[PDB]
Scaffold this active site. Structure first.
Site, PDB file in Angstrom:
ATOM      1  N   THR A 182      44.667  76.143  57.076  1.00  0.00           N
ATOM      2  CA  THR A 182      45.380  77.340  56.682  1.00  0.00           C
ATOM      3  C   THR A 182      46.718  77.041  56.054  1.00  0.00           C
ATOM      4  OG1 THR A 182      46.131  77.662  58.959  1.00  0.00           O
ATOM      5  CG2 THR A 182      44.192  78.831  58.224  1.00  0.00           C
ATOM      6  N   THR A 183      47.232  77.842  55.060  1.00  0.00           N
ATOM      7  CA  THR A 183      48.505  77.586  54.500  1.00  0.00           C
ATOM      8  C   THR A 183      49.541  77.677  55.570  1.00  0.00           C
ATOM      9  OG1 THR A 183      47.779  78.768  52.561  1.00  0.00           O
ATOM     10  CG2 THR A 183      50.216  78.194  52.733  1.00  0.00           C
TER      11      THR A 183
END
Lengths: 237, 241, 245, 244, 249, 53, 231, 204, 244
Positions: free
Chosen positions: C32-33
């Site tokens: 995930t960012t």
């Protein structure tokens, strides 16, 4: 150490047990026949190699107690590891509950040792198979058991283990009768000697016979007595 | 099939596993040049800082291990902090059980043994760093000791590290041949910083600005690192040479 | 050349590299960012938390865990593995707090985790971690911000990023530091964390996401790590919409 | 597809040694067990590999305690460890609670034992190098559910069966149990059913030196039938099919 | 963790122990070193070697004192010598200087370091040390004695021998030049002469490290006035002193 | 190599394993129909006696 | 390929494969469906016999006086983790007199599965639990993945044909959250959920095992003729 | 009373000129009862002598302990132990039982074979290396003995004049001890021969 | 993975057999020859060094003769390093039995203890064997002179005469043709030099390649005396027998 050396096979086995069984066959040959009132374990003893002593060289059949004798076939090196435990357990029996061992009990313990080494991390299992024999104390029924590397034990009326055990056992189906044991102790010696001279051969200089009579009589026969039974049997035959 | 996969010997008598560490050291591309002054030791090193987003104050390869012992690290930065932690720790322990601050000579041999054990295991990876320990000792004077992943070490009149260090070794060797005195002489430490910076500008064929240098000097009873502000005052001092 | 060199990690390859650990950077690449903006007065973490199904409970899952009362830790990659690395530093931090009775410095704490990930690369018997963390907080020496690679490498940072959208993030954080190379406000930086999560959502524009934001700031929170919630969180959301329009 | 672990998977998701372990229950010698309303009958093909074998002191039925009995098939050395643990286990509960342990609760303890191979990890101290390959038919009687018969696997899972066979003759045996069984059969008609199904998959001759019967009744506890009663019962099967 | 509890020295199939065989290759890669046993001393000798001239040789050591009566000099790997010298001093104090109060005889100490050898030719997670040591010394009942401890873990008593890359040529020179009376000063002339034919690089009193186990010097004792004890028998030769004997060739 | 085994070049993997007791029985009968056998032959007993074949 | 033998070896795809393999144990497993409202949680499990003579294997293990878990993987693996959850639920009552939070109990569970998957000579645990409970912030439904990963959902499934179950839950999503206080209706909404994961096996009074926990109902397992009203 | 004072005994060792002599009395009993007169307290390891008095169980365990050591020394080294390293051997093994000691007193008497030099040393309890070239006394009647040795002793006696000197010093001292008297043996140790003499000491 | 680099030194082959014990014996066939003959008035022990050099000190060497206790010395043939360890164990154990029973240790006891130690390594631990072969010369009152050989398998067999090391087949055959039951140490001295002369790989046998020791009861006062002959007496006795 902690790595498994005994592991499950994709067949249904453990290869180290099948292998260990192969190990008993490459050993020398021990025979068991019980009379009406005797056990007789006789064993084939080497003499390809010469200048070998007779007094100080250990025998194939080692008295655990005064009434329990053990014979072994397979690796002659390994043998002494199972026997060292077996002797100490007999003295522990005397200590903690009293009475000396019963033959069934010592056989169950010895089985439990080989059983454990078939399933404990960092051991291979013993490549050695026993004929454990003897008398129950204050009884006189002959007891003859044989335990094997699986860790399984069986009682036998007569049995044979080591090299060419199938060939010898065939002989014993045809001359020892389950219903009528050899009528006396002496008839029982002639049977074990009659069996051995098939495979062992090469004189009476290889044949060893230990005879036990009830009430703690262990006697191991002299080379002269052996010759005498071999000769009679050769001649009669 | 397994002789170059744990640190056991080969049919040659070599340990390739130990050898690969020496091929990991020079993959960071960070150079070092270290000379023993008259009463100081000066070590100058690059400080490559790739991206804009790194905070530059934190990027370092000069580690303070004692008051008197600094340690300059060439090779990957994970292996650098684990060799650095083990060093500070051993320095504390020595102080504890023997009652004086640790002399460099002894730290050099101490991290060497730990290197040696790491190539006689089978579950330990040798740390792939070359550490140079610069000091000023009160019995043996300014010294340089260089340890390496195998567990060998030797003292040095000067030493260099990195992948362009073959070049640096050439300049320093000429310098000590011509002069014929084993250590560089000049009384003030500030000016050994100047001589040292010239020799890195000649050897690599590159100029250096303040953020590209990070300089450690061990003088008497103290190790400091020069702030990048103070390193420029030295870069100006090369303009009047 | 010899065959081997990828079955363990205390092998080196013939070029002096790792394997597992080089393979471990690709485990972190699917994550995930997660960004961190270092403001002058603290840190702002923000993380894209995907709503991967309509059966998840919104605002009840988190990947931002606090360690002590003043260090936020935020991770991407293997999420269970990542909680374990935070868990180790809650034990380490707690030990420090008893022995010296001060909250563990950010440079001290950086040092403590760092060793830990490095230690798992020294044996053939422990699996190297496949997470990258961004952590920082406010201590007595000011604000600091660290990214710790799976390789057991960490450095100082003014902005850091991890996951899939690390390409857009890294590029978008260069711009914010060229708007304000003289520093920026911690109130403000909430809103910028919002803007750089929505632009980095374009590698991942297949799905829909919940933005979670947190801050540890000296002048609004008194140097204690708290979550950005309520009205302030909805302002940042409305900010991000208007920018991406 | 792979097997160079000790406690490893398997693209399927089973443990791998366990998968092999179950296929060594095909090298057992039968234990059959019918549980009815009046008791549970256990019979076993005893096997003689030679006639110079004493086959009346080899037995594969063993009493755990008065009210739980067991029949074992597969490799019997493995069975030596587990049955000891079982003896121990039953005794502990009579110590701690002065109560006759349930059958289920007993089974459940022994399944936790079958999974304890490994190189030493978890909360359960590994010390086995490979799993067991023996299956148990835990028979028994509790005062909570009456008569019960369980099948304990070397997997580590246990199911209460109304009738099950295990061994080499499993397939041919449970195909018959299916058809012939009903809800209620009286106890001596259960004993004859054991001897009928044991006879179809028999590789020998049905007689008393190579079949053993045993019951569990509440009133008599666990009794292993002497050769005198096993012989009689055999004779009443060859008689009863002889009116058909 | 540790799971390496299995030996990595294993029997090879046509016989021999493969790791110990290999490790002896690694002995013959390194420097050349030799020892000559006289009737009143033992001389030991080695060549220094550096990466560059920038290394100092002054702080380098390759001949070490294990006890004042017993020195060692190696040929093989630098790292392995370094730890094994320290383990040798350690067992020499711990097992004869705390028990019988004094430094151990040369036969005894040799026997202990062969057992240090032995427990890295065996046990798990270890390979053999990659040095062969001469451990020369003097004890009071077996005289001057020179030994060779090897990667196998055997020892051999010697009267003169050589180890290292020039071992083959060295010992033939030494077989023909040996004699059954040598003085220690006469011993030196042999050892230097031989070590000159194995060097081809520079030759100086700073690049040949030479040690004598002569006879007793009370100037290294450190003190005077207990006449019961008699100073270091071991005495490493300074660069100045070695240089005269070099000219004496 | 991994490239061959993906579908579209080997659409279906078709798995062949050692038979069970009924399985082993059919194959014995398929061999034995060309042989001279008495009626006393009960193949059920000797398939059971052959395992993992 | 060679990457699949142990739990330490990455893996060029960013994975580790063995944990991937253990996730297929859940798929070959039987279905259990969880759904929750704002006041009662329901586990609806379908029990599985082997043969006709066989019993059915318990799929819902009451873990505490306000917690119940349901397995969909290895039966031996489920026994290890269930003890560990009981242990930490009882250690909380003893030391802090606190009912163990549902949200906290997913984190305790989490780390027991991670530490054997990071370690050599260990393995992952190939069982997924659905863990219901009613604590101080209400009803909770946790899905424990054998990956170690915990997620909190309003309704989920795991098993075989499980996807067909998530869909029933996905449609009926905005309905069931709003019915509160009426456990009859949630139960029925969960029976119908697990019935689209059938393929000729049906549901009966020996297949269906329901357990609920409420605000006003402590942990109750219904079985027998007590799941005969709720087909 | 205290552990030593149960069992008593003395050992006396006195130098001659190029010879030494170690002597003890044969009593071994407990409290008031004297039990035996055939237990010798003098033992030897090669050509070195060690007598030991006090606590009776520790007399024999130290006898056995010393025998184990010096057999190991003699096999490895390929010689008997000299007396100077014997002192050190006694000392060391006392000191590893520092906490709870053997309640003994070993007395060493030997001849350094290298120089021909007579050698004597004392110990009591845990350690203490009593260097002397005069004499040594130990056991319960260390008062009786110390006095005698100082008065009679003249440096440099012939081994026959040494035999007379030591016998007198042991005699008047043993029988003014209540825990002694019942024989005596004196080993005159020349470097050519070791003669063992039993004296006519009166009974208690 | 650690398991990846494990030898598995200590499983069986398909033959039923232990590769690594077989190989150990392979390497002892390289090593130095040692022969022992038990006369009826002594045991003569003689072994020929596997290496020789003229710079090699061979005058105070005793790298084949090692004394275990006062009455039992052994000859060594194999991995000398491995042997040095077990010689020093043996010496600890022999001295131990004397400490606790105050009785000379029998030959049988020390020999069996050493055998089982070798035996531990082929049995478990995952370690390589100790490749050592001992010939034990020993005296006890009970059985007189006793003679014994032990192998790496950890098995012991009595002998009257035996040969281990290089050229075992050759040496063994020679002993047998000559050996009589009525031999004293003099005949034994002559035979031990003589068999060694026939197996030798040097152009003539010499004293500097012979190590030689006896144990005679013909030493004074009916005591056993262990004598390891000095090389200058060996050279003397070599002139007597007319070998040189």
């Amino acid at each position: 150490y902690d790595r498994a050396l005994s592991i499950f096979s994709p067949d249904g086995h453990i290869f180290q047990v099948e292998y260990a069984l192969e190990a008993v066959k490459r050993g020398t040959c021990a025979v068991g026949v019980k009379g009406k009132n005797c056990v007789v374990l006789g064993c084939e003893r080497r003499s390809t190699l010469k200048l070998q002593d007779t007094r100080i060289t250990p025998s194939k059949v080692s008295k655990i107690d005064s009434h329990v004798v053990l014979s072994f076939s397979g690796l002659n090196a390994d043998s002494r590891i199972l026997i060292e435990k077996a002797r100490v357990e007999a003295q522990s029996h005397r200590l903690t509950l009293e009475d000396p061992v019963t033959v069934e009990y010592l056989t169950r313990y010895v089985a439990g040792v080989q059983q454990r080494y078939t399933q404990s991390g960092g051991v291979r299992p013993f490549g050695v198979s026993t004929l454990i024999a003897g008398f129950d104390p204050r009884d006189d029924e002959p007891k003859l058991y044989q335990t094997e590397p699986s860790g399984i034990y069986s009682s036998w009326s007569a049995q044979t283990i080591g090299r060419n055990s199938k060939t010898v056992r065939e002989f014993l189906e045809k001359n020892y009768d389950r219903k009528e044991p050899p009528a006396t102790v002496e008839e029982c010696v002639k049977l074990t000697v009659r069996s051995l001279l098939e495979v062992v051969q090469t004189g009476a200089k290889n044949i060893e016979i230990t005879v036990v009579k009830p009430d703690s009589d262990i006697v191991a026969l002299s080379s002269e007595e052996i010759n005498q039974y071999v000769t009679q049997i050769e001649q009669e035959k | 099939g397994y002789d170059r996969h744990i640190t056991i010997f080969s049919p040659e008598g070599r340990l390739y596993q130990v050898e690969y560490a020496f091929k990991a050291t020079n993959q960071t591309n960070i150079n070092s040049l270290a000379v023993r002054g008259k009463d100081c030791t000066v070590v100058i090193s690059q400080k490559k800082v790739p991206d804009k987003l790194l905070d530059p104050t934190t990027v370092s390869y000069i580690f303070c291990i004692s008051r008197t012992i600094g340690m300059v690290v060439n090779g990957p930065i994970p292996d650098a902090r684990n060799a650095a932690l083990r060093a500070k720790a051993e320095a504390a322990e020595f102080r504890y059980k023997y009652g004086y601050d640790m002399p460099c000579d002894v730290l050099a041999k101490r991290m060497a043994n730990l290197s040696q054990i790491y190539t006689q295991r089978a579950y330990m990876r040798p740390l792939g760093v070359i550490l140079t320990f610069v000091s000023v000792d009160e019995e043996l004077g300014p010294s340089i000791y260089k340890t390496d992943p195998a567990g060998y070490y030797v003292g040095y009149k000067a030493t260099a590290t990195g992948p362009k260090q073959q070049e640096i070794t050439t300049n320093l060797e000429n310098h000590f041949k011509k002069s014929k005195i084993d250590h560089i002489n000049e009384e003030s430490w500030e000016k050994v910083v100047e001589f040292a910076i010239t020799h890195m500008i000649d050897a690599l064929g590159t100029e250096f600005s303040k953020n590209d240098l990070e300089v450690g000097v061990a003088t008497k009873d103290k190790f400091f690192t020069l702030s990048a502000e103070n390193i420029e005052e030295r870069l100006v001092a090369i303009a009047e040479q | 050349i010899g065959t081997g060199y990828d079955l363990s990690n205390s092998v080196f390859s013939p070029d002096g590299r790792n394997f597992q650990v080089e393979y471990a950077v690709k485990a972190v690449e699917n994550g995930t960012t997660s960004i961190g903006i270092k403001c002058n007065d603290g840190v702002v973490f923000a993380v894209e938390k995907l709503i991967t199904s309509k059966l998840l409970v919104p605002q009840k899952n988190v990947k931002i865990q606090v360690v002590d009362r003043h260090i936020g830790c935020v991770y991407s990659g293997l999420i269970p593995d990542g909680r374990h690395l935070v868990n180790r530093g809650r034990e380490e931090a707690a030990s420090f707090k008893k022995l010296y009775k001060t909250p563990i410095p950010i440079p001290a704490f950086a040092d403590r985790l760092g060793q830990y990930v490095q230690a798992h690369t020294l044996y053939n018997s422990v699996r190297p971690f496949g997470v990258s963390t961004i952590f920082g907080g406010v201590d007595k020496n000011g604000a600091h911000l660290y990214m710790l690679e799976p390789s057991g490498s960490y450095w100082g940072y003014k902005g850091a990023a991890t996951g899939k959208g690390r390409q857009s993030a890294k590029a978008e954080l260069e711009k914010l530091v060229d708007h304000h190379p003289e520093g920026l406000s911690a109130r403000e930086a909430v809103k910028q964390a919002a803007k750089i999560i929505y632009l980095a959502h374009e590698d991942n524009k297949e799905k829909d996401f919940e933005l979670e934001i947190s801050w540890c700031s000296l002048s609004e929170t008194n140097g204690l790590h708290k979550f950005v919630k309520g009205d302030l969180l909805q302002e940042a959301i409305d900010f991000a919409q208007k920018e991406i329009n | 597809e792979y097997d160079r672990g000790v406690s490893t998977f398997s693209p399927e998701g089973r443990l791998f040694q366990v998968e092999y372990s179950l296929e060594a229950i095909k090298l057992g010698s039968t234990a059959i067990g019918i549980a009815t309303k009046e008791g549970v009958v256990l019979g076993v093909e005893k096997r003689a590999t030679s006639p110079l074998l004493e086959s009346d002191s080899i037995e594969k039925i063993v009493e755990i305690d008065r009210h739980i009995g067991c029949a074992m098939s597969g490799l019997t050395a493995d069975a030596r460890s587990m049955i000891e643990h079982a003896r121990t286990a039953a005794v502990t509960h009579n110590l701690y609670y002065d109560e006759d342990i349930n059958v289920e609760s007993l089974t459940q303890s022994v399944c936790d034992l079958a999974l304890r191979f490994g190189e030493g990890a978890s909360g359960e101290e590994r010390l086995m190098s490979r799993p067991f390959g023996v299956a148990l038919l835990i028979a028994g009687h509790d005062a909570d559910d009456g008569y019960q018969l369980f099948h304990a696997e070397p997997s580590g899972t246990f199911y209460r069966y109304n009738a099950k066979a295990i061994g080499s003759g499993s397939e041919g045996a449970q195909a018959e149990l299916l058809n012939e069984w009903h809800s209620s059969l009286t106890l001596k008609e259960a004993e004859l059913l054991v001897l009928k199904i044991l006879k179809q998959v028999m590789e020998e001759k049905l007689d008393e030196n190579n079949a053993q019967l045993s019951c569990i009744t509440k009133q008599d506890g666990f009794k292993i039938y002497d050769n005198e009663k096993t012989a009689e019962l055999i004779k009443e099967l060859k008689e009863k099919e002889a009116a058909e | 963790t540790d799971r390496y509890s299995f030996s990595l020295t294993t029997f090879s199939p046509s016989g021999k122990l493969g790791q110990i065989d290999y490790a002896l290759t690694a002995v013959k890669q390194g420097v050349t070193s030799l020892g000559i046993k006289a009737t009143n001393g033992v001389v030991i000798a080695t060549e220094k070697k550096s990466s560059s001239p920038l290394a100092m040789s002054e702080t380098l050591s390759k001949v070490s004192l294990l006890t004042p009566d017993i020195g060692a000099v190696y040929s093989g790997m630098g790292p392995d010598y370094r730890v094994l010298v320290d383990k040798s001093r350690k067992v020499a104090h711990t097992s004869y200087k705390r028990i019988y109060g004094e430094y151990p005889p040369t036969k005894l100490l040799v026997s202990e370091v062969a057992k240090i050898m032995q427990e890295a030719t065996q046990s798990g997670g270890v390979r053999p040390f990659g040095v062969s040591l001469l451990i020369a010394g003097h004890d009071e009942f077996n005289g001057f004695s020179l030994y060779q401890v090897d990667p196998s873990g055997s020892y051999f008593p010697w009267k003169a021998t050589a180890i290292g890359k020039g071992s083959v040529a060295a010992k033939t020179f030494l077989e023909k030049r040996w004699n059954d009376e040598l003085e220690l000063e006469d011993a030196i002339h042999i050892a230097l002469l031989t070590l000159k034919e194995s060097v081809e690089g520079e030759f100086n009193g700073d690049t040949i490290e030479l040690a004598i186990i002569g006879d007793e010097n009370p100037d290294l004792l450190g003190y005077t006035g207990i006449p019961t004890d008699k100073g270091p028998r071991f005495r490493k030769l300074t660069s100045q002193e070695i240089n005269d004997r070099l000219e004496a060739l | 190599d991994p490239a061959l085994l993906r579908p579209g070049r080997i659409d279906r993997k078709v798995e062949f394993s050692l038979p069970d007791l009924e399985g082993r029985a059919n194959i014995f009968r398929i061999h034995s129909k060309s042989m001279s056998v008495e009626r006393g032959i009960r193949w059920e007993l000797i398939s059971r006696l052959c395992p993992n074949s | 390929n060679n990457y699949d033998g142990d739990t330490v070896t990455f893996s060029p795809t960013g994975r580790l494969f063995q944990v991937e393999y253990a996730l297929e144990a859940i798929k070959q497993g039987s279905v259990t469906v969880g759904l929750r409202s704002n006041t009662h949680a329901v586990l609806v499990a379908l029990k599985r016999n082997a043969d006709e003579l066989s019993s059915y294997q318990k799929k819902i293990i009451k873990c505490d006086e306000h917690m119940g878990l349901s397995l969909a993987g290895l039966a031996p693996d489920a026994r290890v983790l269930s003890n560990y959850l009981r242990q930490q639920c009882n250690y909380s009552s003893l030391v802090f007199n606190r009912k163990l939070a549902v949200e906290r109990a997913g984190h305790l569970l989490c780390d027991k599965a991670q530490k054997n998957t990071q370690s050599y000579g260990g393995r992952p645990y190939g069982v997924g639990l659905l863990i219901i409970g009613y604590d101080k912030s209400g009803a909770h439904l946790l899905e424990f993945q054998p990956s170690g990963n915990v997620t909190e959902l309003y309704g989920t499934a795991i098993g075989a044909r499980s996807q067909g179950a998530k869909t029933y839950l996905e449609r009926t999503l905005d309905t069931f959250i709003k019915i509160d206080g009426n456990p009859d209706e949630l139960i029925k909404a969960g029976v119908e959920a697990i019935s689209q994961s059938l393929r000729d096996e049906s549901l009966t009074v020996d297949n269906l095992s329901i357990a609920i926990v409420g605000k006003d109902t402590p942990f109750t397992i219904y079985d027998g003729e007590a799941v005969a009203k709720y087909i | 009373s205290d552990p030593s004072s149960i069992n008593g005994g003395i050992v006396v060792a006195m130098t001659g000129k190029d010879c030494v002599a170690i002597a003890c009395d044969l009593r071994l009993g407990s409290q008031s009862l004297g039990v035996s007169n055939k237990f010798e307290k003098i033992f030897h390891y090669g050509h070195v002598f060690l007598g030991i008095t006090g606590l009776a169980t520790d007399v024999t365990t130290l006898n056995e302990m010393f025998r184990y050591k010096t057999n190991l020394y003699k096999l490895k080294e390929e010689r008997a132990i000299e007396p100077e390293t014997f002192t050190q051997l006694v000392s060391s093994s006392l000191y590893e039982r520092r906490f709870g000691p053997y309640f003994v007193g070993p007395v060493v008497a030997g001849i350094n074979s290298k120089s021909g030099k007579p050698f004597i040393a004392g110990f009591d309890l845990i350690g203490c290396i009593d260097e002397a070239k005069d004499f040594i006394v130990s056991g319960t009647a260390s008062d009786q003995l110390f006095g005698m040795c100082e008065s009679l002793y003249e440096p440099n006696l012939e081994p026959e004049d040494l035999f007379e000197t030591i016998s007198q010093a042991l005699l008047n001292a043993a029988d003014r001890d209540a825990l002694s008297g019942w024989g005596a043996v004196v080993y005159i140790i020349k470097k050519d021969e070791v003669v063992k003499r039993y004296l006519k000491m009166r009974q208690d | 993975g650690s398991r990846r680099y494990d030898s598995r030194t200590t499983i069986f082959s398909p033959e039923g057999r232990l590769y690594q014990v077989e190989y150990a014996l392979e390497s002892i066939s390289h090593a130095g020859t040692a022969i022992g003959i038990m006369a009826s008035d002594g045991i003569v022990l003689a072994a020929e060094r596997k290496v020789t050099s003229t710079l090699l000190e061979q005058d105070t060497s005793t790298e084949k003769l090692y004394k275990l206790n006062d009455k039992i010395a052994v000859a060594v043939a194999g991995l000398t390093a491995d042997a040095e360890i077990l010689i020093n164990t043996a010496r600890i154990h022999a001295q131990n039995y004397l400490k606790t029973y105050n009785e000379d240790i029998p030959v049988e006891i020390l020999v069996r203890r050493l055998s089982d130690i070798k035996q531990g390594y082929t049995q478990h631990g995952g370690l390589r064997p100790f490749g050592v072969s001992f010939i034990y010369a020993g005296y006890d009152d009970r059985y007189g002179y006793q003679l014994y050989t032990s192998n790496p398998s950890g098995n012991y067999t009595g002998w009257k005469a035996i040969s281990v090391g290089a050229n075992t087949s050759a040496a063994q055959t020679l002993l047998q043709m000559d050996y009589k039951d009525d031999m004293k140490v003099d005949d034994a001295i002559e035979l031990a030099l003589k068999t060694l002369s026939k197996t030798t790989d040097s152009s003539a046998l010499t004293y500097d390649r012979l190590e030689f020791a006896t144990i005679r009861k013909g030493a004074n006062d009916g005591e056993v005396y262990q004598k390891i002959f000095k090389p200058q007496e060996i050279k003397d006795i070599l002139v007597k027998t007319g070998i040189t």
